[PDB]
Coordinates of C-alpha atoms in Angstrom, one line a residue:
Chain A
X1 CA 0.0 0.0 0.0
X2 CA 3.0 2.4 1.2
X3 CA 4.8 1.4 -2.1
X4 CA 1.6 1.9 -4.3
X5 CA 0.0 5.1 -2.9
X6 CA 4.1 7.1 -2.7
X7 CA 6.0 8.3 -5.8
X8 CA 9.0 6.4 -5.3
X9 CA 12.2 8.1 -4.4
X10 CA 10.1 10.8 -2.5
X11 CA 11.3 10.7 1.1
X12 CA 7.5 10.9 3.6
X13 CA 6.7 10.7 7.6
X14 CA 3.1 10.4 9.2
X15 CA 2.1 13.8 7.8
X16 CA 2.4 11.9 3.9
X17 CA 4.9 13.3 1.2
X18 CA 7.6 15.4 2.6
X19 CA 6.8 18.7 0.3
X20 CA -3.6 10.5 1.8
X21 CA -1.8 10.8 5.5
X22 CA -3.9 9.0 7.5
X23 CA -3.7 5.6 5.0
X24 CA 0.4 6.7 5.2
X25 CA 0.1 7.0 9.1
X26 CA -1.5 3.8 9.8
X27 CA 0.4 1.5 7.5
X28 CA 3.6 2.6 8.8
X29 CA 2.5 1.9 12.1
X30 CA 1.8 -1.3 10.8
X31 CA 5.0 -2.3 9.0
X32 CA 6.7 -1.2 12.3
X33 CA 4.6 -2.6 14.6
X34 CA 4.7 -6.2 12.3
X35 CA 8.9 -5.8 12.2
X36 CA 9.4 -5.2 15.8
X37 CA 6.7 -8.7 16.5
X38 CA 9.1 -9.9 13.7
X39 CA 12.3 -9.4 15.4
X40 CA 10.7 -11.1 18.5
X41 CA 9.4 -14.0 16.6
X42 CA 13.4 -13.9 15.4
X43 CA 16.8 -19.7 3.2
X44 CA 13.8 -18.5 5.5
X45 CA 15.6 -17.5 8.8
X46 CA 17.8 -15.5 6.6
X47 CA 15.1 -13.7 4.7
X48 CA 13.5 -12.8 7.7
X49 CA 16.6 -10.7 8.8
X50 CA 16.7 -9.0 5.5
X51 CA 13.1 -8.2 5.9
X52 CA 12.6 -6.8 9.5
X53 CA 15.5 -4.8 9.4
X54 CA 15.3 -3.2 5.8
X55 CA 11.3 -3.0 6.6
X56 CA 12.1 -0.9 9.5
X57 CA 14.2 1.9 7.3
X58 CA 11.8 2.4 5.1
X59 CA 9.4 3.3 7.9
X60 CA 12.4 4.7 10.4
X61 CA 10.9 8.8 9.1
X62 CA 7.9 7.4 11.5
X63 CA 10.1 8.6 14.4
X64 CA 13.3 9.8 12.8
X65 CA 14.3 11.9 9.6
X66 CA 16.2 9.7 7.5
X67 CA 17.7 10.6 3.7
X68 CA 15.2 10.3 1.0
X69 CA 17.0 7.9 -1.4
X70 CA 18.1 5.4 1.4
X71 CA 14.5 5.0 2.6
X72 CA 13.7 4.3 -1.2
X73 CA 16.8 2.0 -1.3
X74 CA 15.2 -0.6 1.6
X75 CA 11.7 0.2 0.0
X76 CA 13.0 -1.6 -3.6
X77 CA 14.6 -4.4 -1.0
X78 CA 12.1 -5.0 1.5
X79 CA 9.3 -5.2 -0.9
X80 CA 11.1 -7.3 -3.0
X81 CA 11.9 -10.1 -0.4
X82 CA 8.4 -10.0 1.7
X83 CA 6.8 -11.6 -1.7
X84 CA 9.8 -14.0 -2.0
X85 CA 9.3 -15.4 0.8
X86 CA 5.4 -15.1 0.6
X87 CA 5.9 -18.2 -1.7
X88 CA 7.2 -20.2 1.6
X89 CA 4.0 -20.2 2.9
X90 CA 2.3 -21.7 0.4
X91 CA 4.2 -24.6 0.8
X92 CA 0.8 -25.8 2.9
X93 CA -1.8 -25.7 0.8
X94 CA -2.9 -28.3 -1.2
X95 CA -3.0 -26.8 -5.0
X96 CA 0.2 -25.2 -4.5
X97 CA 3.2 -26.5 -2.5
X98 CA 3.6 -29.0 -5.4
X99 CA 4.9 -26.4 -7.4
X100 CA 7.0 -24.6 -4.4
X101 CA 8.7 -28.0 -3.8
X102 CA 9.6 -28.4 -7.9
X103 CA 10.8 -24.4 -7.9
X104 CA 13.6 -25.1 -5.0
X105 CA 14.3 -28.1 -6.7
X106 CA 15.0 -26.5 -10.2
X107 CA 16.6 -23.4 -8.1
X108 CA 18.9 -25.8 -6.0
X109 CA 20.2 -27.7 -9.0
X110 CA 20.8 -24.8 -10.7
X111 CA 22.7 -22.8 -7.8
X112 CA 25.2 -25.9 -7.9
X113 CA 25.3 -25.9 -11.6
X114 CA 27.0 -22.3 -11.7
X115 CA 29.7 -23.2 -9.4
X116 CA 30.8 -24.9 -12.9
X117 CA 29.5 -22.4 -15.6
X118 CA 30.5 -18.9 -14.2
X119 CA 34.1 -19.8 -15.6
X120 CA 32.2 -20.8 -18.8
X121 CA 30.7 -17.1 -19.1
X122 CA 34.2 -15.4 -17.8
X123 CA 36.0 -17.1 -20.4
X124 CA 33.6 -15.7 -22.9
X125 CA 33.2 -12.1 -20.9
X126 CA 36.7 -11.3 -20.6
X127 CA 37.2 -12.3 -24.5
X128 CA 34.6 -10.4 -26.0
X129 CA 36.0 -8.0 -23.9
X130 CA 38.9 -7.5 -26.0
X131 CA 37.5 -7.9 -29.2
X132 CA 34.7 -5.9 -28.8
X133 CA 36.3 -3.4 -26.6
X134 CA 35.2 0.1 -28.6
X135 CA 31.5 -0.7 -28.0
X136 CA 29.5 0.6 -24.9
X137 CA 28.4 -2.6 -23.9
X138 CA 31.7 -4.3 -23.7
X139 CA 33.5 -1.0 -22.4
X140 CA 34.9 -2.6 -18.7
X141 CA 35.5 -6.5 -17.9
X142 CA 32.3 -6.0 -15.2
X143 CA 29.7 -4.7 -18.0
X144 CA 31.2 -7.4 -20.3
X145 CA 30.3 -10.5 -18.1
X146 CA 26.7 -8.4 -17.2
X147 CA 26.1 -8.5 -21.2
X148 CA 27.4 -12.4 -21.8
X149 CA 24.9 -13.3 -18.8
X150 CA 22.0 -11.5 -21.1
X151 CA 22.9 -12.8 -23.8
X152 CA 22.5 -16.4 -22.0
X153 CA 18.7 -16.5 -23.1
X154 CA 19.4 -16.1 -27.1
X155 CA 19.2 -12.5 -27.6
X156 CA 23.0 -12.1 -29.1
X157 CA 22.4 -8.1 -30.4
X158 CA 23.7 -9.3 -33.9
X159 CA 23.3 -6.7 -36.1
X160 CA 23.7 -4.3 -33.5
X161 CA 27.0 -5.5 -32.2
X162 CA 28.7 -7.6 -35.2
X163 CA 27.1 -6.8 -38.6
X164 CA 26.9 -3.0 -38.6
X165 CA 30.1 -2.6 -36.9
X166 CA 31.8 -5.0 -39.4
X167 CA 30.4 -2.9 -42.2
X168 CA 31.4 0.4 -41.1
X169 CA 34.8 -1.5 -40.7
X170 CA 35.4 -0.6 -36.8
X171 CA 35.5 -4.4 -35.7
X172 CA 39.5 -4.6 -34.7
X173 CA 39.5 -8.1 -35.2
X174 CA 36.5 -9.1 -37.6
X175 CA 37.6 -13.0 -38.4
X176 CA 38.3 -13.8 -34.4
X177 CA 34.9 -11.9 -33.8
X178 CA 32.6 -13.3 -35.8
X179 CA 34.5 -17.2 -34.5
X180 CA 34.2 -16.4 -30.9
X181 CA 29.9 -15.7 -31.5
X182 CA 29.3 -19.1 -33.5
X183 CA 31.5 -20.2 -30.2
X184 CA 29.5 -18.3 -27.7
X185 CA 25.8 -18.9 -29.4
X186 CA 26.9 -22.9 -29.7
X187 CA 28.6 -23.3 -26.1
X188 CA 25.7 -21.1 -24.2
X189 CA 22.6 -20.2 -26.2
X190 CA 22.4 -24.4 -27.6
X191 CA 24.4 -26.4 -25.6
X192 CA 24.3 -24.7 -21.8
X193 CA 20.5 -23.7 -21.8
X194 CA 19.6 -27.4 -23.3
X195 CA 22.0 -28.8 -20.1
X196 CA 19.4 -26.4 -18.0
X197 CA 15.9 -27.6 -19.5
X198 CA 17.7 -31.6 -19.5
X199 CA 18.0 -30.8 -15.8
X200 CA 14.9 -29.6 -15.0
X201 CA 12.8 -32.0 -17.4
X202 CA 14.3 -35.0 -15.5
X203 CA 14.3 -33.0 -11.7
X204 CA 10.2 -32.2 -12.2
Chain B
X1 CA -12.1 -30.6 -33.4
X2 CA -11.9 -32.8 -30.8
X3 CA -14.5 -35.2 -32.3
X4 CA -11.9 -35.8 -35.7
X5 CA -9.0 -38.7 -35.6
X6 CA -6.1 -36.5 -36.2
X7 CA -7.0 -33.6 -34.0
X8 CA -8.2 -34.9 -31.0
X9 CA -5.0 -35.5 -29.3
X10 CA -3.5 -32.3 -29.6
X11 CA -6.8 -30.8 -28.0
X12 CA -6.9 -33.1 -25.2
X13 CA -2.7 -32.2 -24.4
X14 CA -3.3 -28.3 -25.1
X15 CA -6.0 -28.5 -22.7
X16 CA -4.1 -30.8 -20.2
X17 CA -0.9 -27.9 -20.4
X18 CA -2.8 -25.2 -20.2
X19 CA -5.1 -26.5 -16.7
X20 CA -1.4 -27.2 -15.0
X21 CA -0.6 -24.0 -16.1
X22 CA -3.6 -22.3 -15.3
X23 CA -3.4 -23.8 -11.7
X24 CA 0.4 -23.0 -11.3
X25 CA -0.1 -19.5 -11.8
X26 CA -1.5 -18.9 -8.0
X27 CA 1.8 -19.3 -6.6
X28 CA 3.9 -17.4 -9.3
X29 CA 2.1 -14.1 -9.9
X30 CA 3.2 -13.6 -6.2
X31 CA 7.0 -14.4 -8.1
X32 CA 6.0 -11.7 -11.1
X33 CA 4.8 -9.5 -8.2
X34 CA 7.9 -9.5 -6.5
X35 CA 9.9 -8.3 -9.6
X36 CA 7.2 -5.6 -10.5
X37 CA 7.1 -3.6 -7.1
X38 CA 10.7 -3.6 -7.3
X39 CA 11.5 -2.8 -11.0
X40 CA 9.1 0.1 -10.4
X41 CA 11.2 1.1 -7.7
X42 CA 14.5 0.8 -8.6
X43 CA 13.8 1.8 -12.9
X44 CA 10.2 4.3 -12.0
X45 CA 12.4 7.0 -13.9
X46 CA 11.7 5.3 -17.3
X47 CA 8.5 4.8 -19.6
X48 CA 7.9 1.2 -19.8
X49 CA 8.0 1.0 -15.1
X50 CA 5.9 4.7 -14.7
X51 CA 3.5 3.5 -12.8
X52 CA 3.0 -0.5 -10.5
X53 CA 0.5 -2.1 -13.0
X54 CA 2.9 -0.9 -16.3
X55 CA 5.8 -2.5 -14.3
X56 CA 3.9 -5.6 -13.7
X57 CA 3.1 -5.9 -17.8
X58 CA 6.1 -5.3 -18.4
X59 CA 8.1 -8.1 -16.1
X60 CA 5.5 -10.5 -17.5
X61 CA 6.8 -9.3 -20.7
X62 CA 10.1 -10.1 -20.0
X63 CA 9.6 -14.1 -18.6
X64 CA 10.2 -15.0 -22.7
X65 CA 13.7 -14.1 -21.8
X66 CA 13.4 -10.3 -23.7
X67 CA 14.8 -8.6 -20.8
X68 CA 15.5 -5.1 -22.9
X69 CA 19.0 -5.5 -21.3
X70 CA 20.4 -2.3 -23.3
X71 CA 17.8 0.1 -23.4
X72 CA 16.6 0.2 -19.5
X73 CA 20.0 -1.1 -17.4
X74 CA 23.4 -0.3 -19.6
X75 CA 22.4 3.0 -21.6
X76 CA 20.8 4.5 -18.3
X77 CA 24.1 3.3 -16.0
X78 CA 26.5 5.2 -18.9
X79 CA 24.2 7.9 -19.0
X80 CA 24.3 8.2 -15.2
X81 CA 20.4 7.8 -14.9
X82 CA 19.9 4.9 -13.1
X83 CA 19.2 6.2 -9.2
X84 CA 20.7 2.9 -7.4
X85 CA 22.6 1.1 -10.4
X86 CA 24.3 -1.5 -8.3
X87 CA 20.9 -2.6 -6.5
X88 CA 19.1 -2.8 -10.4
X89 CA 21.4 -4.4 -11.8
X90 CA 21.7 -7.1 -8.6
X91 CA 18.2 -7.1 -9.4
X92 CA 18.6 -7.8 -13.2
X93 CA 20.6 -11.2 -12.6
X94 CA 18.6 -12.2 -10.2
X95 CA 15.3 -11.6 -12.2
X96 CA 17.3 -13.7 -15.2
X97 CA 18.0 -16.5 -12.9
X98 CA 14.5 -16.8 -11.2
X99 CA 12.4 -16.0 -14.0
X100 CA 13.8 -16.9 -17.8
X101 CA 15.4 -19.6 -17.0
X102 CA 14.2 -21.3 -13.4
X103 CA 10.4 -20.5 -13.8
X104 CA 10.3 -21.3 -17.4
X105 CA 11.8 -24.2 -17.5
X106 CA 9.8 -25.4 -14.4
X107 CA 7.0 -25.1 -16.5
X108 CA 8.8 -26.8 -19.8
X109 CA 9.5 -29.4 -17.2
X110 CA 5.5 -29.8 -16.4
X111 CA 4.5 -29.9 -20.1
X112 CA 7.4 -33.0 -20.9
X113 CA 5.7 -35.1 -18.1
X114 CA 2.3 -34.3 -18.5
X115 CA 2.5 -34.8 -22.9

């Protein structure tokens, strides 16, 4: 309600927007009164301390003026994890905790998988880093391994990254280039997301 | 068409997919959810997140995998627009992980067993 009803990044106290207060008032008290229970009552033990304690900074300008972009920056976190771990209770009832069950399943097997394939990406990440290294997306080795981790799912950028740079004639390496994206698109787009489904279709 | 001998089949396994589907989605709108409040947090600056029932179109939008990478987390982050870039693009990865490829293949995974 407090994250619907507020512009975000706006900092407010009981009185609303710092510039619908009573509906502000109340659920603050609320979200307070619920953390502090929540701390007494204290991956689900974990996420529980994540959301009591970032729950309470979004709601601290109840009682205490607090910058306007941190209480915006537990907002986007505390919101975030109080419907992740909404799905832990529907673990108990009976059309449902079928499907919580098969998602940690898929999500466990996974989270072991990557122990392995994080070096396949860097290997990648760090080489498409030098070859590609006079386009924005590939400008640091950091924003290269965030761009090889998108293009994970198929969505290589083509045109937009080989093609029309290849053709304006500011690829510094064109052959190598073009040998390292039938490379990537065989070992991550085929081959890795295939191992993924092959995992998940026998796991289910 | 389920009352011709070609047809029948498919209609009895598009129906069969599509009630599994139909009853898994009570659990994961609550994961779509999750992503939406946050996205419109964390990216409310931009068009496509302006307001919470946009951002939640839009993250459903993005489960085929279409995560418009460049144009809302990269070109904002160089442009210095993005108002907590390490938080969105935490965020991002995690959305990838839990969304393309855990809760879509979780239901690829439903649709082998139950064909």
């Amino acid at each position: 309600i407090l994250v619907v009803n507020i512009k975000p990044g706006m900092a407010f106290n009981s009185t609303g927007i710092i510039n619908n207060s009573y509906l502000i008032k109340t659920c603050m008290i609320l979200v307070f009164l619920s953390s502090i229970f929540g701390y007494c009552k204290e991956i689900s033990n974990v996420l529980e301390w994540i959301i009591y304690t970032t729950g309470i900074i979004f709601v601290l300008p109840l009682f205490v003026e607090i910058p306007a972009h941190l209480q915006w920056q537990c907002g986007a976190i505390a919101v975030y994890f109080y419907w992740m771990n909404f799905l832990l209770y529907l673990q108990r009832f009976e059309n449902c905790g079928i499907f919580i069950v098969m998602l940690e399943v898929i999500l466990k097997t996974l989270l072991r998988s990557t122990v392995v394939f994080i070096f396949l990406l860097l290997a990648f990440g760090l080489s498409f880093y030098i070859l590609l290294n006079l386009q924005d997306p590939f400008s640091s080795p950091l924003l290269s391994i965030i761009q090889t981790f998108s293009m994970m799912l198929g969505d290589i950028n083509y045109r937009e990254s080989f093609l029309e740079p290849y053709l304006r004639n500011e690829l510094a390496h064109p052959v190598l280039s073009f040998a390292q994206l039938v490379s990537f698109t065989i070992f991550v787009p085929i081959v890795l997301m295939n191992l993924l489904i092959g995992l998940a279709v026998g796991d289910i």
